[PDB]
Amino acid sequence: SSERIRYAKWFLEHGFNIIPIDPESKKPVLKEWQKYSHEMPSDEEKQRFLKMIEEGYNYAIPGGQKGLVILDFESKEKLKAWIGESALEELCRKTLCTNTVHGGIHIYVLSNDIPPHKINPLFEENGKGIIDLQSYNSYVLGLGSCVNHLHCTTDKCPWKEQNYTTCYTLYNELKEISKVDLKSLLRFLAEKGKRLGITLSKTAKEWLEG
Ligand SMILES: [Zn+2]
């Protein structure tokens, strides 16, 4: 089988809900997918979803479920300079991290205290967001999903309009998504980044500071 189906099955194996995506539109198959952050899809849907994936459909992982939040950093290099290699390697040593198809990085973690909604952006630099926190009613594409950049017609894509396909891949190794003190982490990120001029967004600071 492909890597897309292997990993999709891995998430289902671990109790996570997944949602099909990407053919024509590049959005979930269901219009009411947001509900999968709060409930299971039902067997007679789960299998339908797999078949779609086993046949070319990418898939996504909704946040919120099981305390899951995904920190979606626009640039893996920026985060490297932001918190230093050791910190990064530590973070992505204890929990699942993946490479995005545009040079970014997704850090998956579980937490007892997470936002009720996604926070976009979580941190900002020189007036722009450099990382989104995906939680309830939001998602991230899953490992194995691939994108043909031929259809990316913006500069947000480093491979703009090239006939080239890349996929969401493992940052290092496959590991279970582990628990963290999200707030402790957002604070560690805060300090570590204050020197670079990277600050919590107002929405992020209000959820953190409470
Ligand atoms: Zn692209």
Say if residues 72 and 140 touch (Cβ distance below 8 Å): yes
Q: Select 1-63+137-143's CATH number: 3.30.720.160, 3.30.70.270, 3.30.300.90, 3.40.710.10.
A: 3.30.720.160
Method: X-ray
d(CA 199, CA 24): 37
Binding-site residue numbers for Mn(2+) are: 72
Looking up tokens 């230093």, which residue turns up? 84
Class of CATH domain 64-136+169-210 = alpha beta
**CB under 5 Å of ion ligand 1: residues:** 149, 152, 157
Distance CA 133, CA 143 (A): 18
Contact 157, 149 (CB under 8 A): yes
Nearest alpha carbon to residue 201 among 114, 131, 140:
131
Contact indicator for 154, 143 with CB cutoff of 8 Å: no
Distance 148 CA to ligand 1 centre (A): 7
Contact 1, 51 (CB under 8 A): no
> Scanning the structure block, which residue is given the tokens 């046949």?
55
Q: Which residues contact 107 (CB under 8 A, 6 or more apart)?
A: 70, 71, 73, 91, 92, 95, 97
Q: Which two tokens stand for residue 151?
A: 């259809």
CA of 75 to the centre of ligand 1 (A): 14
Q: Three-state DSSP class for 146? A: strand
Distance 151 CA to ligand 1 centre (A): 7
Task: Indicate the resolution in Å.
Answer: 1.9
The answer to whether 100 and 144 have CB atoms below 8 angstroms apart is no
How far is Cα 194 from Cα 188, in angstroms, rounded to an integer?
10
Please give the DSSP secondary-structure letter assigned to residue 66. Answer: G
Domain ranges of the chain: 1-63+137-143, 64-136+169-210, 144-168
Q: How far apart are CA 190 and CA 209, in angstroms?
A: 12
User: Which amino acids are annotated as binding site for Zn(2+), given as ranges?
Assistant: 14, 102, 149, 152, 157, 176
The crossing angle, in degrees rounded to 10, of helices 182-194 and 76-83 is: 80
CA of residue 209 to ligand 1 center, whole Å? 36
Query: What share of residues in the chain are helix, strand, coil (percent, to 5)?
Result: 35, 25, 40
Domain 144-168 has CATH 3.40.50.10440: no
- Determine the distance separating the centroid of ligand 1 and the alpha carbon of 149, expressed in angstroms: 4
